[PDB]
Amino acid sequence: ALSLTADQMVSALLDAEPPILYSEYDPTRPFSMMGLLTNLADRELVHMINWAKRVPGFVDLTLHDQVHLLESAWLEILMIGLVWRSMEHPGKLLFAPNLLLDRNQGKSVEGMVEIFDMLLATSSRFRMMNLQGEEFVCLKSIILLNSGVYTFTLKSLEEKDHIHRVLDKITDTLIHLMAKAGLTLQQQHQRLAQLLLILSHIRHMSNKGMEHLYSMVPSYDLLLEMLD
Amino acid sequence: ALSLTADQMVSALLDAEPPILYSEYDPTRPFSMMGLLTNLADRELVHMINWAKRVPGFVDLTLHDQVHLLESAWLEILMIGLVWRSMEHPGKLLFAPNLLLDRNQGKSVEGMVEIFDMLLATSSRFRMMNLQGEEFVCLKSIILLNSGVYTFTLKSLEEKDHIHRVLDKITDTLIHLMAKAGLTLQQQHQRLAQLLLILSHIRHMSNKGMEHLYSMVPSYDLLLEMLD
Ligand SMILES: C[C@@H]1Cc2c([nH]c3ccccc23)[C@@H](c2c(F)cc(/C=C/C(=O)O)cc2F)N1CC(C)(C)F
Ligand SMILES: C[C@@H]1Cc2c([nH]c3ccccc23)[C@@H](c2c(F)cc(/C=C/C(=O)O)cc2F)N1CC(C)(C)F
C-alpha cells in the first residue's frame, strides 16, 4: 500500500468500488420507507465489508482495528455513496435506481426530513464543486481510515502510524489528480481543503443519523463475524 | 478580508484571540463538576462572540448567518480551545489554569469520561503533530466558518460564496505558514490534510457533547441578542 504510485492507488480504489444496489419492494404493488431504507443499508454493509478489505492498507491492520474503523465509519460511508449517486438528481436522493426520493417523501418518518435535507445540501455542494469519480473514491477511503483513528499498546501505536501514512498516500493521490486536471498549486490546496472540510459535515450527518437509530445498527460481533 | 495577505490574516487571528479564563470555585473550600464545566462554558461563549466578530470576513455576513454559524460551531470551538490548552499536559484537560482535570475526575458524571477520553486523544494527536499557535488560530476560524455553511435566496448564495472564499484565504494562510516553516510541497499538503481531518473528529466530539446536553445550551435568541 505504501509503495503505490498515485495512478495505482486510484486504479486500486476504482476497482474496489462496490455495486449500486436496488431496493427490494414489489414495483407492481402500491407505494414502509424505514423498512426500505433499513434493508438497503443492511445489504450495502455487506458489500462495504468487501470494499474495505480492498482499500490498500486496510487488511494490514488487526481484525479488532478493522472492526473499530468500520464501526465508526459505516454510516458516513453509506451517506457519501448516496450523496455521490444523487449528485446529478437535484432535489432527490438516489438510494437506488428504483428508489429516488425527494424531501417530502422523507417527511413520513419523524426526524427524517432534517436528515434528507442535510444529504441533499451535501449533494448540492458536490455538484457545485464538480466532484470527480476519482476524487470521490479517495474521499470515501479517507473516511474509512480516519473516522475511527482517534478513538482506539505498541501494536496500536504502529497501527495508527500506518493509518496516517496511508492517509498521506491518499492526500498525495488527490493532489496528483488535481495537478493532472490542470489546477494551479493554489487551486490544488484550496480544493483539497474544500473536499476535506465536507467530510466534517458527513461526520455530522452520521452522528445525527446514529442518534435517530439509537433512539429506536450493526453490532461489533456482526462486523467482526463478517470481517473475520 | 479577501484582500489580506497570509501574514495579515495570521496577525489578525492572533490579535483576535480570546483570553484564558479561570474557573469560579472557592479554592479554599473543599473539592459540582457539571456546574463548573457549565459556568466556564457560558463565560467563554461571551468571549467567543467577540472573537468571532474579529475573524476577517465574519462581520461581512448577515446577522442571521452569523448566528447560525455560531449556533453550529460553539461547542467545537470550546473543545478545540481546550485541546490546544491541554496539549502540554499529557493525560489532563486544562479547562482553566485552576481546573486541570484527568479522566478519573470525569467519571463522576455519567457519560462524561467518554467525552474526556476523546478530548484527551485529540490533545495527544495535536502533541504528536507539534501543532503551532498560528495553525491553531487558522483551524479555529475554519471551524467557525465551515461547521454551519452546509445547513443554511440570492443573499444566501452570496453568503456561502463569501464564506468559501474566506476559507480559501485561510487554506492559503496555512500553506504559507508551513512553507515558511520549511516543509516541502509534499509535506505541506500532507500536513494540511492531517489538520483538516482532525476537524471531523472535533465535529464528532461536539455531536457527542450536544447529545449529552439535549438529554438534560445557548438558544438562537441569546446568541442573536449577544451578536446583535
Ligand atoms: C437516510 C440515511 C442514510 C441511508 C439510510 N439507508 C441508506 C441506504 C443506502 C444509502 C444511504 C442510506 C438510512 C438508514 C435507515 F433508515 C435505517 C438504518 C438502520 C440500519 C440497521 O438497523 O442496521 C440505516 C440507515 F442508513 N439513513 C437514516 C439514518 C437515520 C440512519 F440517518
Ligand atoms: C467537556 C466538554 C467541553 C467543555 C465543557 N465545558 C468547557 C469549558 C471550556 C472549554 C471546554 C469545555 C463541557 C460543558 C458542560 F459540561 C456543560 C455545558 C452546558 C452549557 C450550557 O448549558 O449552556 C457546556 C459544556 F461545554 N463539555 C461537556 C459536554 C457534554 C458538552 F461535552
B200 vs A200: CB contact, 8 Å cut-off? Answer: yes
To 5 degrees, how large is the angle CA A118–CA B48–CA A205?
15
Please name every residue paired with B183 in a beta bridge, in sequence order, or none if there are none. Answer: none
A contact set with B (CB within 8 A): 118, 121-122, 125, 142, 146-147, 150-151, 164, 167-168, 171-172, 175, 185-186, 188-190, 192-194, 196-204, 207-208, 211
CA proximity to B120, closest of B97, B147, B100, B142: B100
* CA of A208 relative to ligand 1 center, distance in Å: 11
Crossing angle of helices B220-227/B63-85, nearest 10°?
100
Residues A165/A161/A159/B207 CA torsion (nearest 10 deg)? -90
Please name every residue paired with A96 in a beta bridge, in sequence order, or none if there are none. Answer: A99
The whole-angstrom separation of Cα B69 and Cα B227 is 11
Exposed / middle / buried, residue B31 (Cβ in 10 Å: 0-12, 13-18, 19+): exposed
The stretches of chain A forming alpha helices (DSSP H) are 6-15, 33-53, 63-85, 103-106, 112-129, 133-146, 154-180, 185-215, 220-227
Instruction: Please check if A162 is assigned to a binding site.
Output: no
The structure was resolved experimentally with X-ray
Instruction: Please check if B44 is assigned to a binding site.
Output: yes
**What is the number of structural domains in chain A?**
1
The whole-angstrom separation of Cα A29 and Cα A166 is 48
Distance of CA A158 to the CA centre of its chain: 25
- Residue B199: which CATH number? 1.10.565.10
Residue A86 corresponds to which amino acid?
S
Q: Which residues in chain B are closer than 8 Å to A118, comparing Cβ atoms?
A: 150-151
The whole-angstrom separation of Cα B90 and Cα B101 is 11
Strands B92-96 and A92-96: unpaired
Separation in Å, CA of B122 to nearest CA in chain A: 7
Residues ≥6 apart with Cβ < 8 Å to B47:
B18, B19, B21
The stretches of chain B forming alpha helices (DSSP H) are 6-15, 33-53, 63-85, 103-106, 112-129, 133-146, 154-180, 185-215, 220-227
Q: Identify the closest residue of chain A to B207 by CA–CA distance.
A: A207
**A88 phi, psi to nearest 5 deg:** -95, 30
Instruction: Please check if A85 is assigned to a binding site.
Output: yes
Separation in Å, CA of A159 to nearest CA in chain B: 14
The whole-angstrom separation of Cα B88 and Cα B178 is 21
The counts of H helices and E strands in chain A are 9, 2
Pocket perturbation via mutation, ligand 1, pick of A94, A213, A214 by most ligand atoms within 8 A of CB:
A213
DSSP-assigned letter for residue B61: S
A53, A169, B119, B122, B125 from B87: Cα distances, Å: 35, 27, 10, 9, 9
DSSP-assigned letter for residue B17: P
- For A66, the 3-state DSSP assignment is helix
Q: Atom 21 of ligand 2 has which residue's CA nearest to it?
A: B217
Cell of A181: 486536471
Which of B146, B172, B186 is closest, CB to CB, to A200?
A: B146
Entry resolution in angstroms?
1.9
The length of chain B, given as a count of residues: 228
Determine contact, residues A174/A195, Cβ cutoff 8 Å. Answer: yes
What's the domain range around B89?
1-228
CA proximity to B74, closest of B212, B209, B216, B215: B209
Residue A118 corresponds to which amino acid?
M
Cell of B19: 483570553
Determine contact, residues B151/B46, Cβ cutoff 8 Å. Answer: no
To 5 degrees, how large is the angle CA A63–CA A64–CA A67?
85
A84, A215, B86 from A50: Cα distances, Å: 19, 29, 40
The whole-angstrom separation of Cα A142 and Cα A46 is 19
The whole-angstrom separation of Cα B141 and Cα B77 is 9
Residue tagged 472564499 (cell numbers): B165
Its sign, for the CA torsion B79, B142, A146, A126, is positive
Q: Atom 13 of ligand 2 has which residue's CA nearest to it?
A: B37
